[PDB]
Every structure is written in C-alpha cells, then in structure tokens.
Amino acid sequence: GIISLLDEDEPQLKEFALHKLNAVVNDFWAEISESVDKIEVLYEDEGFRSRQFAALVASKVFYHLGAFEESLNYALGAGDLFNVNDNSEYVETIIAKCIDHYTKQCVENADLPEGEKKPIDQRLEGIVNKMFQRCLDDHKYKQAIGIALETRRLDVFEKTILESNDVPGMLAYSLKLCMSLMQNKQFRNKVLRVLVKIY
Amino acid sequence: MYEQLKGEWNRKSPNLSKCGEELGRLKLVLLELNFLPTTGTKLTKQQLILARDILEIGAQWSILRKDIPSFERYMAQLKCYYFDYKEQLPESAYMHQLLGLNLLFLLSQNRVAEFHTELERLPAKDIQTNVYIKHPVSLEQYLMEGSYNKVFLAKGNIPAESYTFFIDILLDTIRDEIAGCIEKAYEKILFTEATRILFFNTPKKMTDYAKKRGWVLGPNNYYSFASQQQKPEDTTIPSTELAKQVIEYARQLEMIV
Amino acid sequence: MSEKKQPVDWDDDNVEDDFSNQLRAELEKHGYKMETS
Amino acid sequence: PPGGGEQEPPPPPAPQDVEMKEEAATGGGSTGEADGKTAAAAAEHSQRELDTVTLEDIKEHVKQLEKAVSGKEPRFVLRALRMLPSTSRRLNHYVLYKAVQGFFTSNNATRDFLLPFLEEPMDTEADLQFRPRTGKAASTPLLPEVEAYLQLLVVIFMMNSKRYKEAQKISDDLMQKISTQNRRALDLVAAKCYYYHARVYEFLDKLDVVRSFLHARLRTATLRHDADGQATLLNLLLRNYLHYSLYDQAEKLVSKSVFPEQANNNEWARYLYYTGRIKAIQLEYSEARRTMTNALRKAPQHTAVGFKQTVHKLLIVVELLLGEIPDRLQFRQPSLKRSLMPYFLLTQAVRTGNLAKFNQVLDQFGEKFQADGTYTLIIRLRHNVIKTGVRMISLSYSRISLADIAQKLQLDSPEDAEFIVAKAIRDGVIEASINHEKGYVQSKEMIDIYSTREPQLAFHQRISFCLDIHNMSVKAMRFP
Amino acid sequence: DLYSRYKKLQQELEFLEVQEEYIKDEQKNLKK
Amino acid sequence: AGSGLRQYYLSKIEELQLIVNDKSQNLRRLQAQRNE
C-alpha cells in the first residue's frame, strides 16, 4: 500500500502520505494495523508539521479495532483538527465515551476533594463544554440539566437554569428531581442550597 | 517533464548522481496532477506512463546497487500501479521479467508462504510461454522435492539478465536449510558425510559452522555438544492443577438453584 | 435454502474398497511361482 | 379459449386465498410480537420469513395476471391504520381487492405502475407501526422483479427499488428503534440487495460499490450490538473478495473480527467453507481438512442442496496431498455424475505410479478444473506424489535399509532418498529415525501405553461439554 | 424527559437483581 | 438545536431495556421452581 511512501524520512513526503491515507482508512481499516508503531513514532517526536494529523489517523485505526481507551487518548492529543468537528458516527461515539470517562472521573474525585485529586486533561472540558454549548444553542433542553446534575457541576447548572426561560415551573421540576430520586446527602444539600439562593 | 529521459542508461549507467536525478524526479512527481486517482484522463494517462517508467528504472537501479529496502519499496509502489482500480495500461515490455525477478526475491528470502498467494493472478502466462515467470516456479518445484543437485546443475541458465544478486543468496539459503534438516542429536557424526554434502571447501566454511554449530570442522569424528532431547516426564505430580480440575467439577455440580 | 451456487451442471454390490488390476489371477501367479522352485 | 378460459378457473382460487391468508397471519404475528414481548427474536417471524424465502418465491415468475399477487399492492396502497376503523378498513380493502380480482379485473401493473404502487403504498397515511410489513411487502416485489428470470427491464428497476428500501431502512434505524431490533429482518433485506448486485454485477460491473456500501453497513453494526447482522455481512464481503476477484487474498487474512458464537446454523457452513478455502490456498493443510469436514456435517441435511458437491470437490484434493480418501465410499447418487469423471480418475492415478496417465487426465479435464477454481493440483499435487509412498513405507515396515526404498520407490539412488526421507521426518509425516552409518531406517519406539495421562485429557473436554449442555438446557425453560 | 426513564430503568434493574439473590438463597435452604 | 443530544440518552437506555427484559423472565422461572 501507500505506506510504501511513509518508509522515507523526507519531510515533504510524509504529510502527502498521511493526507492521502486518511481518505481511504475505512476501506482498508484493518490492513493498516501493522503500521501503528510508525505513526505513533511520527506523532511523539517534536518538530513535525502536522502531529495532529498523525494523531487523527491513529484515532481512526484504533476506533476500527474498538480499543476505545486509546482512540480517546489520541483524540485528546489530536487537538482542534478533530475536536472542531461535529457530525459523524465516529466523533459522536468517541465523544460519548469521553463524556462517560469525564463523569466517572468527576464522581470519583468528588469523594476526596481535599487534595490529591487525579489530574484532568483540560481537553476533556474542551469537549464537554462544547457539547454543553450545543445544549445551549437551544431554548431549554432538559437533557442539559441532566448531564449538569450527573457531573456534579453546579456552575453550568446555575448558568443554564438562569439563562433561557427561567420559568419557575422549571425550578420546581429541579426540586422534584432533587427530592425524588437522588440520595447522597452531601450532594443533595449542596444542590438544594444553590437552588434556594437562585430562588 | 522529461528530466533526462535517457541521460545515462543507453550506453552505461554507473552514475551515483542518478540517485540525485531520481530524488528530483520523486520530488516532482508528487506535484503531478494524478497519482492516487483512478478515474483517469489521457493527460493522467501520460502522467501514469511516466510514473511507471521512472519506477521501473528506480527498481532496476536498486538491483544494480544491491539495495534491499529501496528494492522492496519501489517494487511495492510499482505493484500497486500494475494492478489497481484503474488498469487500462497498455502493455509494458518489462512487466513479465520484472515480476519474475520479484518472485525470485520472494523465494530467496524464504517467504514461500507468500509465494503461491501472489501466483493466483497469472492465468496462462506462467505455463505455456513467457520464460521469465517459468523459471522461478520451476525452481520452486525443484526445491519442493528432495531433489537438490538438479538445482545447482540448472543454475547456469537464466533467461533475463544475470540476476545473480539473488541466486547467490538462494544457494546459500538452500545450503543452510539442508544443513538444518540434518539435525543431529548425536554429537559424533562422520565429517566425511558432510563432505559428501554440498559444503565445498573443506575448512573454509567448516570453521564457520564450527564456531557456533556443533560437531567438528571436517574431523571425521565429530566432538561437541549434543542435540539429544529427553522428555523427563517422570514427575507424577500434576497434583496442584488436577486437584483444581476436580474441585471445578464439584463447583458445577452445585451452585445452581 | 438456496445458495446461488448453480449446482446442476450400475451395480448394487456396495463399496468396492480398493481393487487394483493384477491381471494374473491368483491361480496363474501361484501356478507358475511353484515352477521356479 | 380452451387453454386460457378453461385454465383460468383453477389458478385464480389458490392465490386468491392461500397467499393472502399466509401474509395476513404473518403480519398479525409480527404486530403481536412487536407490540408485546419486546424480545420477539424467538417467534414465528423468522419462520414466516423463511417460508416466504422458500415457498412463495418459487410459486410464480410471471406478473401473476388476474390480479392474484400483483393485486396486493393495489390492496394495501391506501392504508391508514391509525385507530380501529382505519386498520379494519385497510383489511377490508385487502379483502375487497381479492374479491374484485376473483369477480372482475382489478388493478394491473404494466412494468411501470409498480412505482405508483410503491410510492402511493408509502403514501395515503401509511403506517410506520408496521415497518416490518413495509419492508416485507417492499422486498417481496423485488423477488418477482428479480426472479422474473428475464434480466430485461427489471434489473435496473431492481437496483432502484433496492436502493429505495436500503435508504428507508437506514433512515428507520437512524432513529434506533427501541425494544424492536428490526435488524432481525434487515439482514435478509441486505442479502436480497446483494443478490441483485450480483445480478447487476452479472449484467454489469462487479460489486465494488456494493463492497464500500457494505463496509459501511457492518460498521453501523458491531457498535450497539450484533443481532445476526455482522454474521451475514462478513461472509457477504469475503464472498465478493473471492468472487472472480478471488486473486485478492492478502487482505481478508487480517479480517480479525470475532465471528459471533450464537449464529444461525446454516451460515456457519458458509463461514467454515470460506475459512477452509483461504487456509488451503496459502499452504496450511493440517487445519484445513479438519475444519472443512467439520463444515460438511454442520448443515448438510437436505435433498441435494448443492454446494456439498463443491466442498467434496475441495476436500478430495486438499486431503489427496496427505494420504488417501475413501476411494469408493463417497461416490453415491447425487455427486456421482460430476466427481466421478475427473476426481476419481485422479485419485486412481495417484495411488498407482503411472505418471503418464496423470498427465493424460490433466490434459483431458484441465478446463473443468479451472472452471471450478481449484487448479492447485498441478501446482503441488503432481510434485508431491512421493509423500504417499513414504507414508506407506512407514505403515508397513519398521526396520529397513534405505538402499531398498530406491528400488521400491524408483528413485534410482540412495542419497537423494536420504534427503527426501529426512525432509519428510522434519515435516512430521513420519517420526522415524535414521542411523547415518549403514543405511538403517528404524521406526520410533513402540507405542508406550495408551493409559498414561493421554486418556484423561480427553475426558476433561467431554465433561466441559456435558455440563455446559445441561446448564444451557435448564436455563431456558418455561418462559411464562 | 429521558432523564427520568434512564433513572427508573437503573432502579428497577438493580431491585430485580436483589430479588434474584433472595430466591437463590431460599432454594438452598428448602432443599436441606 | 436540531436534536442536539438525541443520539445520547437514547442509545444509552436500549441496553437497559434489553437487560431487564430478559432478567424478568429469568426471575419468573425461579419463582415457579421455588413454589413447587
């Protein structure tokens, strides 16, 4: 295959190979897999021209194989060349799994806020808040509030409830959810207090 | 665009600056109108005739300079061009002998498994005529039977150019494979029996095997380490795991309610 | 079930296992084997 | 008059009633199992689809005049099915169309009204609730237009209708139907489309465009889950990879998707046949023969299904290289006409030492061998005959002078005999040993004993099997 | 909307799991 | 905003539906065995 060009270290050729290749990854999805070391090396070193482009094709190949953890990692590394996109099966799958990783990380850290919280790659927020904005390009989608409560973020919660139609029926809905089907007292009372303030 | 079409090929091609000319050619072809595309155009057809010819010369220079990675790279590119979604491709005179040389390379580097799987594409040119393809399959057949001396007898007949750069390696690999087949547990074998085998010089290469391999270098009374193997299955204690198995059977006789 | 594979292009003595022509029947072979010695 | 008027009474009655009540009961059951018991995989839906595949398809090829089956479209063309009167009136319309067709001439389609009988069918407040009915009644018109056996003015329509149905099902599954999993039917649809593409690729260019489309098709599967979807797409794609473009082999060797454990039994046979073909063509012979025999007995139980013939014409060559076939056992009534003419003459030549007769048979039937796409025999079988002789020598003698095999196997020299026997032992066909001193070949040690640690290794496997079967059985007992 | 269905699905799933464990235990003692 | 998050909250619950759908039947089977 055209990997026959990647074999050469001339910098001019490399980017032509990657640009030509990511156009056909789907038809030859598995065939490529005996080359992922080369692409990873060409991502790790500094001073290439489109390190994001190598990270992108790596993410595509690992999404073929369903190694979702590593597709996620390289998608974080792939920067804006990926993250700016917004309408495909591939992106929606890996952003869903990113949301999942983020919410579970948040829930874990929330039990020990006093320190030594594990690091958060800010790209996770860089994707989550982008989705939050999509859930802001709209009048009052309930789901936004759902993810808000699920991720323990009172800030975007408040910003969403005050923004858009702050119909008091909606905050009565929020009180109903707070009382009806959530139980962790230490989070319950915090949500309830921010609600009494806004009220 | 015609960068010394026949500058240093018609009369003599020893140039190392030909490498620089090829570098310029590869730098220029990447900016040509169509490489990846398969819809094609007559202009694209010209660009493709040009790419095919330059790749052919690149591969032949590779064999002339006896470089391996450049050989496999150029051959992969050309084989991608030769068969493809677009293959109008008026016949090129070098296709047959170059493909035969490719098969010789595949056989010499002991990739026999990938040999036959490349032979499916050729329906009739591999048997009736076209001696270039005939040669490597015939040698493969010769080396599938225990017949060996016939290979060395028939070595001196090659329809294309010398191509010895691969035939020497093939002979060496056949020699070492035949040696490996004569795997000997007994450390003592008569070296004269090996002398009968096609080892040629009595101590020139006998020392080479002697340095690492066992036996002696032409002794006629070999002394060295032995390749005898004993199972040593005397131990009667697979008890730790066999007990596991039994407990497991008891596990699935219960815990269903 | 149809597989689109286009399949369509004497004695009840049962299995004959493997018989190979010997030509000479046992009577001939032994009849003239004895003659030698 | 004596042939058209007199033969008209007999025909009309049967399609008027039996087919209509068939599709009525099938649609009723589909609605019932889609409404209740959301896990409707185990139902008569699959049996109904199989019966339609088997029975209804063959009963007719022509456009079914007198409005017997062509009238169903004008029956269900206007369907509301919103409330009780709407569904009742759609059924009444079906009945009234049948009655009119039995009384007078109902609506007829002149090879161009099927689109209005398909556009208006999805028009007139059509019901999404019977999405499966839409698919079934849209695919059934394909087979008539497909199995018209004309290949004129219907293949193009077949391709357009197939694209329509594919788009409809893709848009339907874009909503990701909940607790329904229409894929249980979709698979068949997919196969059907591939059918016409082959027909298309029989009337026109190959199915490469289909290849891209179906890569996308299995990609949209395997993500949520798998329900008989990928299990079909895999063998469809590697069918096209090996469909007169079989020269491509390198890739599929890296098709590393796991094949789903619980599949329809009929498909496992296709999978194992193709796996056997790919294994044998690249020169592995140990696994090929065993997995191919496992394939043959997997689902052969039918009155001359047809591809069993091909698997036999492969297993004979693939095991000719290693031993002996049942020489007269398998030449029985179905295969006898084909297998006998070339393959029997071959194996007969192979056991004997007649090279000239081998060449004669090769010259005679090479065209048939290439037509079958199994021309490996000349490639390797001609030059591997001596292996059988070595095997026989192994079975009989136990201590022999290698100077004798030369006169027994016409090699004319002892040294190359040493070479060929050494190669054979290295290859593992025989585990003998050689005294490299005085032309002595000896067999391995006698079989030590058949009751030391080799037996119980098998009984462990059989327990795993038996306890697994009992658990599987007890679990799925009496659902309500 | 979908949030309530999501949560209720989770709850009823785990609760029928609890019933399942209960039934296994009662089987075990009734046999004795 | 043109079905911003309909592909979420929707593919997430389908597995839940299938799991509970089968698990209830399993529970009823155990019910019958215990009763007898």
UniProtKB/Swiss-Prot annotation, chain B:
GO CC terms, sorted: cytosol; nucleoplasm; nucleus; proteasome accessory complex; proteasome complex; proteasome regulatory particle; proteasome regulatory particle, lid subcomplex
Domain of life: Eukaryota
Residues covered by the PCI domain: 69-238
Biological process annotations from GO: proteasome-mediated ubiquitin-dependent protein catabolic process
Record text on subunit structure and interactions: Component of the 19S proteasome regulatory particle complex. The 26S proteasome consists of a 20S core particle (CP) and two 19S regulatory subunits (RP). The regulatory particle is made of a lid composed of 9 subunits including PSMD8, a base containing 6 ATPases and few additional components. Interacts with DDI2. Interacts with TASOR.
Cross-link (Glycyl lysine isopeptide (Lys-Gly) (interchain with G-Cter in SUMO2)): 204
Range covered out of full length: 94 to 350 of 350
Location of Phosphoserine modifications: 13
Keywords: Isopeptide bond, Phosphoprotein, Proteasome, Ubl conjugation
The organism of origin for this protein: Homo sapiens
Biological function: Component of the 26S proteasome, a multiprotein complex involved in the ATP-dependent degradation of ubiquitinated proteins. This complex plays a key role in the maintenance of protein homeostasis by removing misfolded or damaged proteins, which could impair cellular functions, and by removing proteins whose functions are no longer required. Therefore, the proteasome participates in numerous cellular processes, including cell cycle progression, apoptosis, or DNA damage repair.
UniProt family annotation: Belongs to the proteasome subunit S14 family.
Designated name of the protein: 26S proteasome non-ATPase regulatory subunit 8
From Swiss-Prot, chain C:
Designated gene of the protein: SEM1
Tissue spec. comment: Expressed in limb bud, craniofacial primordia and skin.
Function text: Component of the 26S proteasome, a multiprotein complex involved in the ATP-dependent degradation of ubiquitinated proteins. This complex plays a key role in the maintenance of protein homeostasis by removing misfolded or damaged proteins, which could impair cellular functions, and by removing proteins whose functions are no longer required. Therefore, the proteasome participates in numerous cellular processes, including cell cycle progression, apoptosis, or DNA damage repair.
Pfam assignment, any one: DSS1_SEM1
CDD domains referenced in this protein's UniProt entry, alphabetically: DSS1_Sem1 (cd13768)
UniProt protein name: 26S proteasome complex subunit SEM1
TM region(s), chain numbering: none
Family: Belongs to the DSS1/SEM1 family.
Summary of subunit composition and partner proteins: Component of the 19S proteasome regulatory particle complex. The 26S proteasome consists of a 20S core particle (CP) and two 19S regulatory subunits (RP). The regulatory particle is made of a lid composed of 9 subunits including SEM1, a base containing 6 ATPases and few additional components. Belongs to the TREX-2 complex (transcription and export complex 2), composed of at least ENY2, GANP, PCID2, SEM1, and either centrin CETN2 or CETN3. Component of the homologous recombination repair (HR) complex composed of ERCC5/XPG, BRCA2, PALB2, DSS1 and RAD51. Interacts with the C-terminal of BRCA2.
InterPro entries, per the entry: DSS1_SEM1
Swiss-Prot record, chain D:
Glycyl lysine isopeptide (Lys-Gly) (interchain with G-Cter in SUMO1), cross-linked positions: 21
Compositional bias ranges of the Pro residues kind: 1-15
Transmembrane region(s): none
Gene Ontology biological process: proteasome-mediated ubiquitin-dependent protein catabolic process; regulation of protein catabolic process; ubiquitin-dependent protein catabolic process
GO cellular component: cytosol; extracellular exosome; extracellular region; ficolin-1-rich granule lumen; membrane; nucleoplasm; nucleus; proteasome accessory complex
Source species, domain of life: Eukaryota
Single annotated GO MF: enzyme regulator activity
Family matches, as PROSITE patterns: PCI (PS50250)
Region feature Disordered, mapped onto this chain: 1-52
Modified residues (Phosphoserine): 401, 413
Cross-link (Glycyl lysine isopeptide (Lys-Gly) (interchain with G-Cter in SUMO2)): 21
Keywords: Isopeptide bond, Phosphoprotein, Proteasome, Ubl conjugation
Residue ranges occupied by any PCI domain in the UniProt entry: 269-448
Family as reported in the entry's similarity comment: Belongs to the proteasome subunit S3 family.
Subunit structure: Component of the 19S proteasome regulatory particle complex. The 26S proteasome consists of a 20S core particle (CP) and two 19S regulatory subunits (RP). The regulatory particle is made of a lid composed of 9 subunits including PSMD3, a base containing 6 ATPases and few additional components. Interacts with UBQLN1 (via ubiquitin-like domain). Interacts with ERCC6.
Protein name as catalogued: 26S proteasome non-ATPase regulatory subunit 3
Curated annotation (Swiss-Prot), chain F:
Family membership noted in the UniProt record: Belongs to the AAA ATPase family.
Compartment annotation: Cytoplasm; Nucleus
SUBUNIT field: Component of the 19S proteasome regulatory particle complex. The 26S proteasome consists of a 20S core particle (CP) and two 19S regulatory subunits (RP). The regulatory particle is made of a lid composed of 9 subunits, a base containing 6 ATPases including PSMC5 and few additional components. Component of a complex with USP49 and RUVBL1. Interacts with PRPF19. Interacts with TRIM5. Interacts with NDC80. Interacts with PAAF1. Interacts, in vitro, with the thyroid hormone receptor (in a thyroid hormone T3-dependent manner) and with retinoid X receptor (RXR). Interacts with ERCC6.
Organism: Homo sapiens
Domain of life: Eukaryota
Originating gene: PSMC5
Annotated protein name in UniProt: 26S proteasome regulatory subunit 8
Role this protein plays: Component of the 26S proteasome, a multiprotein complex involved in the ATP-dependent degradation of ubiquitinated proteins. This complex plays a key role in the maintenance of protein homeostasis by removing misfolded or damaged proteins, which could impair cellular functions, and by removing proteins whose functions are no longer required. Therefore, the proteasome participates in numerous cellular processes, including cell cycle progression, apoptosis, or DNA damage repair.
Transmembrane segments annotated in the record for this chain: none
